[PDB]
Design goal:
Chain B: One of its GO terms (cellular component) is nucleus. The structure is cut from a larger assembly and holds chains A, B, C and D. Chain A is of the alpha/beta class. Chain A has 10 helices and 11 strands. The radius of gyration of chain B is 28 Å and the shape is elongated. Classes of the chains: A alpha/beta, B alpha/beta, C mainly alpha, D alpha/beta. At the A-C interface, helix 1 of A face loops of C.
């Protein structure tokens, strides 16, 4: 009986050779499913984007088309006609001119510097260093946006808009990203130059895009440009540019609280004077607060120099308080240059560290360098 | 019943080439053959027809030109009865012919076996080779001869049939499109010796010899730099994930340079070993 | 609820419900579908009246006395409502009297001689179509030189309708060793006369003439494999299927495997995978394992052929796991793949209800679901009709028995009927030939002398089946 | 010299015309090619067969009808205006008095030199069933021209739908050497010098090859460098499978 058993042992040995077929078959099915997915996707009739308007008792829904116009289609088998509401983004096939699929609901119009990001990279240690600077940000921003129940428990409205004050060279542009980073909020940069075009209807709808985007994206932080007079990014508005669009823009700013009634929307604005803009902006719903950046005093500027000394390379014996007393009223922009010029002499010394003697020549330089012209 | 058209390799290339001039321009031709109804259908030879002021239409058929051709087509024995016509149009979702609508009704009176063929792609062919024909059913498809007994019929499920704009009724009266190609004994050996995938023959001894070893002037020239190209391709993707985890968010990155430099190396070795492998017998 | 769905879809809906219903009454002689229901008969087309008439042949099969009286009004000399339906009456006598039709053999060949001269109409060949198929079944298993010569003159006429009937009629008389001279003669006529309904019937006829010859048929197999004709390669698989059936052979496996791969014809690849099941009829345990390897492919006809080929050997055998192999084929968007899948499921699931196979609940729901739903495929719901008709065939009783211990060898009538099912929408449904494989399951002692059929009781261990029937 | 490019549709239609006329071996078929001969590369965009009758036993017996040429040429003007007669083709391997005298007959309707083509209906040996031949005088001398098969974009794609490396070149290269061995033997028995003059000229084309031995090893050196890269191809597959093996061992644990 051993002749059959010993011969059967070869079958068990060849059984492991059958295992090589499963490796080739699975690798072959990956190529079959790949080409099979190609043939279906080789001929694409194309599909545009449209918004649902209203529903009809005939089981056909009206969808507005941006390049063309409102057109009624037939709903699919997996799409409910009653579940379609107003301003609902859905997919419509361009061949049969019928409803295809349903997309996700969010505001995504033409984006020029309008892209909503998440936790940009900034910290309070770099552009900070003042006690009142961080203290004013907490109550005006962090409290209403992160914990809206604080003001609702007291029966008072939460602050929405804010105006920044201070000497030139604050640097609040980089601080605006630190606000959204530590509060776990999305950052929104608004540029009035890209929202104004000469084509008919662009002076309105482009601002309406910001009006509609803030509804669903409300748990975020909005930062506006072109109005900043405080020395970070200095524009101070446009004479002819803001002489028209201001009626289509600043009007929708107050509509958020009055009409949309959306909370957790922090409008960060800044300027040293109100001239070109609406003199009525001081009313609630537009400007809810005024924050003033303290000037670079002795105690405030001394801690600013300690900020750059951490990322830079300094030697022993350097007095960080004495160097701050050698200069006068250096803002965040001037401190960076004194530190940059201090590293400039280190390159001529062929040294990776900035000697204390370089700081003595940096104070007598940058102070006289900025005074010229 | 209906008719199943069987276009050979000779008729398909001729009817196509006649309508390959221009996207907007339309032309027409005549099909000839000898067959019987009740399924089977053949096409012997075709020739293009002149274009009139109406372009493709029923009045565009010249009885003077058609009679002169049938006398000239008798010399080789290819003269047969008129089996239909073929036209050329850019194509649409329904009624690919922008002019002909009822013209087939006048064609059915002359010959009940006549059809109207329209080439949709017009040099757009991706390799599918999809052509459209037409036949007038008039009153039918109710208590009569049953057409959909042959091949690929009774279509129209939901809204998707063929182009998907036709659905059930197709062009007119559900003509039940059926098309099949065949190759005879002479067409089998001729095409494989002319065009199968790409024709390299007649160079057969120099086929891969001249294209590679004799093309070394600039082809693989500076193989040391060619090997440097494979280095930069591998070093780029291999640097991505060395931890076998999710870092740069990639999947096939290690397999991208694997398949690219594998075929290049396979070609580098075969050409190099066959340089002295031809054995031209140089001696001294 | 199945046959009341719609009156359209030409005959493909009417053929599905007529062929399926004819299986349920098979052997019980119940005409209620034709008689008691008027409208479903009138909605049929011309060639569609063949199924309505031939359905009675499956129903009345086994009647050697009144079987002729069922077709009496449609017999020649009584005329008929038309000449399309008259041809089905002569075929109905072929299903009932097959092998017993020596009396009808002289009766059916006289009609062929009358129409052997020529044909002026299309319905004339329809009368000859059903006559040639009826005499082929009546003379099936017996070599007759008169039937071979009578059908040979029909082949010379090159009929587009009865051309296949003459080839199938001669092949059933040549079953077994056959006539070696008829092998090369019918093979020569296939090369000389090129026709779809003819050469395809000749290719199947050249498969039937070689039965159990094994290596003796290799001379004809080599000529078909070397030729590039699509129809000659189609009959080459069935020639390998019939000769190499029964005891398995690895030489026939290597032939059917290389053809289903190298050749790009979907119809030939489908014929090669179906021909493999006829060789594997002995061992049904390895059949699903091979189908699982062929279940994943880019071609629909390859998966469609393996579907029905799986149910051939697994019909009356065990290994219920073949149902899970056919599950992904049920979800295939291809229309004809789901049709052959429902038929293959109907063969294995016979008498599998009542806590035997847990999958009987999903197959019973798909009967009414696919037919009433318009989102499914046309051929999918048309195959679900016969699928419900095969499990309920003969009144839930009859089963498909092929290569069992009772017969002891390959059943000739059962293997030929399954080959005809492989051709459905290519020309016209041949499913009426399947009635040869349906036999009832009964245990009775009768007597030791003559016919009795008494009534007694056993009371031994058995599963609960006969008292479990489809409910409302 | 010049070049000749023949489309596959011309040769496919020319072979079936031989069957349509039921021409046996005792007769041969003759036809006309159409195209543009103005450029250096002669291209045939159209062809049609002619009812050519010939006796094989008598080289002085031939039948060529010129009336069908004038009518067919006028009919093609309403089809394609860019197609003109560039010459004439013919069947059969042999060139006899029938094909040589008719070469000047088509010259009346052909502006440039008529292109001669020997069409093999049986397709005997190698490739190229039809060879390109040009007529030139010094006795009629027919010189061979390079014959390439090239079609349009949709023409090559349309044929692929109808039909839908190292060892290959070596087997095809050895057949060329075997054809040369029989070429010198068949020519030697015919004489007992013009072709041998061109053969002995290209035969000569390790004093100077002493430094040419290293170049063989220099290419073999890169082959191993390539095999080093070729080995890296499977070195990643060596790593790729362990990427699964770490997930494979985490399966039984979850079960």
């Amino acid at each position: 009986e051993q002749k059959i058993q010993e011969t059967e042992l070869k079958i068990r040995s060849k059984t492991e050779n059958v295992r090589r077929l499963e490796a080739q078959r699975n690798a072959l099915n990956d190529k079959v499913r790949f080409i099979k997915d190609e043939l279906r996707l080789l001929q694409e009739p194309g599909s545009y984007v449209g918004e649902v308007i209203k529903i009809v008792s005939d089981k056909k829904v009206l969808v507005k088309v941006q390049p063309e116009g409102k057109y009624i289609v037939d709903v699919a088998k997996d799409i409910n006609v009653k579940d379609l509401k107003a301003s609902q983004r859905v997919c419509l096939r361009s061949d049969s001119y019928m409803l295809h699929k349903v997309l996700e609901n969010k505001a995504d119009p033409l984006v020029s510097l309008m892209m909503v990001e998440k936790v940009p990279d900034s910290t309070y240690d770099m552009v900070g260093g003042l006690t009142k600077q961080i203290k004013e940000i907490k109550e005006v921003i962090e409290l209403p946006v992160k914990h809206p129940e604080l003001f609702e428990s007291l029966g008072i409205a939460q602050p929405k808009g804010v105006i920044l004050y201070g000497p030139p060279g604050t640097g609040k542009t980089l601080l605006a990203r630190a606000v959204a980073h530590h509060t776990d909020c999305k950052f929104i940069r608004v540029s009035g130059a890209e929202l104004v075009q000469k084509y008919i209807g662009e002076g309105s709808r482009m601002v309406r895009e910001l009006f509609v985007m803030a509804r669903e994206h409300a748990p975020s932080i909005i930062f506006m440009d072109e109005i900043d007079s405080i020395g970070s990014t200095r524009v101070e508005g446009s004479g002819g540019g803001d002489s028209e669009v201001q009626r289509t823009m600043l009007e929708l700013l107050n509509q958020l609280d009055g009409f949309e009634t959306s909370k957790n929307i922090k409008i960060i604005m800044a300027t040293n004077r109100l001239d070109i803009l609406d003199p009525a902006l001081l009313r609630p719903g537009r400007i809810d607060r005024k924050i003033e950046f303290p000037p670079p005093s002795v105690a405030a500027r001394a801690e600013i120099l300690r900020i750059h000394s951490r990322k830079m390379n300094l030697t022993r014996g350097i007095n960080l308080r004495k160097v701050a007393e050698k200069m006068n009223g250096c803002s965040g922009a001037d401190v960076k240059g004194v530190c940059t010029e201090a590293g400039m002499y280190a390159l001529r010394e062929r040294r990776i560290h900035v000697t204390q003697e370089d700081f003595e020549l940096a104070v007598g330089k940058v102070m006289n360098k900025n005074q010229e012209t | 019943t209906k008719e199943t058209v069987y276009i050979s390799s000779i008729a398909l290339l001729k009817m196509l080439k006649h309508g390959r001039a221009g996207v907007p321009m339309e032309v027409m031709g005549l099909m000839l053959g000898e067959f019987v109804d009740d399924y089977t259908v053949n096409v012997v030879d075709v020739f293009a027809m002149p274009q009139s002021g109406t372009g493709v239409s029923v009045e565009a058929v010249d009885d003077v030109f058609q009679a002169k051709m049938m006398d000239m087509l008798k010399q080789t024995g290819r003269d047969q009865m008129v089996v239909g016509w073929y036209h050329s149009h850019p194509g649409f979702g329904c009624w690919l012919s922008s002019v002909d609508v009822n013209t087939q009704k006048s064609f059915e009176q002359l010959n009940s076996r006549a059809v109207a063929v329209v080439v949709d792609p017009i040099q757009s062919v991706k390799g599918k080779v999809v052509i459209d024909a037409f036949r007038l059913i008039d009153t039918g498809a109710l208590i009569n001869n049953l057409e959909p007994r042959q091949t690929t019929s009774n279509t129209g499920l939901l809204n998707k049939a063929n182009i998907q704009a036709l659905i059930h009724g197709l062009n007119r009266h559900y003509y039940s499109l059926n098309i099949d190609y065949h190759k005879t004994a002479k067409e089998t050996k001729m095409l494989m010796n002319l065009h199968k995938e790409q024709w390299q023959s007649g160079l057969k001894m120099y086929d891969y010899e001249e294209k590679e070893e004799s093309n070394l002037a600039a082809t693989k020239s500076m193989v040391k730099i060619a090997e440097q190209y494979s280095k930069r391709i591998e070093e780029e993707k291999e640097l991505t994930e060395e931890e076998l985890k999710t870092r740069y968010v990639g999947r096939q990155d290690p397999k991208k340079h694997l398949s690219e430099t594998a075929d290049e190396t396979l070609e580098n070795n075969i050409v190099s070993v066959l340089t002295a492998g031809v054995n031209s017998v140089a001696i001294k | 609820k199945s046959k009341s769905s719609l009156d359209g879809k030409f005959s493909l809906f009417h053929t599905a419900v007529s062929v399926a219903n004819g299986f349920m009454h098979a052997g019980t002689t119940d005409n209620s579908f034709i008689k008691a229901n008027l409208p479903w008969l009138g909605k049929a087309q011309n060639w569609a009246k063949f199924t309505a008439t031939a359905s009675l042949g499956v129903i009345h099969k086994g009647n050697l006395l009144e079987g002729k009286k069922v077709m009496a009004p449609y017999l020649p000399g009584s005329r008929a409502s038309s000449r399309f339906i008259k041809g089905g009456s002569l075929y109905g006598l072929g299903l009932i009297y097959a092998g017993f039709g020596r009396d009808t053999t002289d009766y059916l060949k006289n009609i062929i001689v009358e129409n052997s001269g020529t044909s002026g109409d299309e319905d004339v060949d329809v009368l000859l179509h059903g006559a040639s198929l009826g005499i082929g079944l009546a003379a099936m298993g017996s070599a007759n030189i008169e039937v071979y010569e009578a059908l040979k003159e029909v082949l010379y006429n090159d009929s587009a309708t009865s051309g296949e009937a003459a080839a199938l009629g001669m092949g059933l008389c040549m079953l077994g060793t056959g006539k070696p001279e008829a092998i090369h003669d019918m093979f020569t006529y296939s090369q000389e006369t090129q026709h779809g309904n003819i050469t395809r019937g000749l290719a199947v006829g050249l498969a039937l003439i070689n039965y159990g010859r094994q290596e003796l048929a290799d001379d004809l197999i080599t000529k078909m494999l070397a030729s590039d004709e699509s129809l000659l390669r189609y009959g080459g698989a069935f020639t390998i299927a019939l000769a190499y059936a029964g005891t398995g052979n690895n030489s026939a496996v290597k032939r059917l495997l290389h053809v289903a791969v190298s050749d790009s014809n979907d119809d030939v690849r489908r014929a090669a995978v179906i021909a493999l099941g006829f060789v594997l009829l002995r061992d049904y345990t390895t059949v699903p394992r091979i189908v699982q390897l062929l279940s994943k492919s880019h071609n629909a006809h390859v998966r469609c052929g393996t579907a029905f080929a799986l149910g051939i050997a697994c019909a009356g055998k065990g290994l219920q796991s073949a149902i899970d192999v056919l599950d992904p084929l049920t979800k295939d968007p291809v229309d004809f793949v789901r049709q052959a899948a429902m038929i293959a499921l109907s063969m294995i699931l016979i008498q599998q209800t009542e806590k035997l196979n847990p999958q009987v609940a999903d197959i019973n729901k798909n009967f009414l679901s696919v037919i009433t739903n318009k989102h499914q495929e046309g051929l999918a719901k048309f195959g679900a009709c016969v699928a419900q008709g095969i499990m309920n065939a003969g009144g839930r009783n009859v089963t498909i028995q092929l290569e069992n211990a009772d017969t002891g060898t390959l059943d000739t009538k059962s293997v030929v009927g399954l080959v005809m099912f492989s051709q459905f929408w290519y020309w016209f449904p041949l499913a009426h030939f399947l009635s040869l494989s349906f036999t009832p399951t009964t245990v009775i002692g009768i007597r030791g002398s003559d016919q009795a059929i008494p009534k007694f009781q056993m009371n031994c261990y058995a599963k609960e089946d006969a008292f479990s029937y489809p409910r409302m | 010299h010049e070049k000749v490019t023949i489309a596959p549709l011309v040769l496919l239609s020319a072979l079936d015309h031989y069957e349509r006329t039921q021409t046996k071996e005792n007769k041969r078929c003759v036809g006309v090619i159409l195209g543009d001969a103005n450029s250096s590369t002669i291209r045939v965009t159209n062809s049609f067969a002619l009812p050519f009758e010939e006796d094989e036993k008598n080289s002085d017996v031939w039948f060529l009808d010129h009336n069908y040429i004038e009518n067919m040429n006028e009919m093609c003007k309403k089809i394609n205006a860019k197609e003109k007669l560039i010459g004439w083709y013919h069947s059969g391997p042999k060139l006899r008095a029938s094909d040589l005298k008719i070469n000047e007959l088509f010259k009346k309707y052909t502006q440039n030199n008529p292109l001669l083509l020997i069409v093999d209906v049986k397709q005997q040996g190698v490739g190229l069933p039809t060879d390109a031949y040009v007529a030139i005088e010094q006795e009629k001398t027919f010189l061979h021209l390079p014959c390439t098969i090239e079609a349009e974009e949709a023409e090559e794609i349309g044929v692929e739908h109808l039909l839908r490396i190292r060892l290959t070149n070596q087997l095809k290269s050895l057949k060329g050497l075997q054809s040369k061995l029989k070429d010198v033997v068949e020519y030697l028995d015919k004489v007992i010098h013009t072709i041998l003059g061109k053969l002995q000229d290209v035969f000569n084309l390790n004093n100077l090859q002493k430094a040419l031995t290293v170049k063989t090893n220099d290419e073999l050196m890169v082959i191993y460098i390539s095999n080093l890269v070729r080995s890296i191809i499977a070195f990643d597959d060596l790593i790729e499978n362990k990427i699964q093996n770490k997930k494979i061992q985490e399966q039984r644990v979850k079960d």
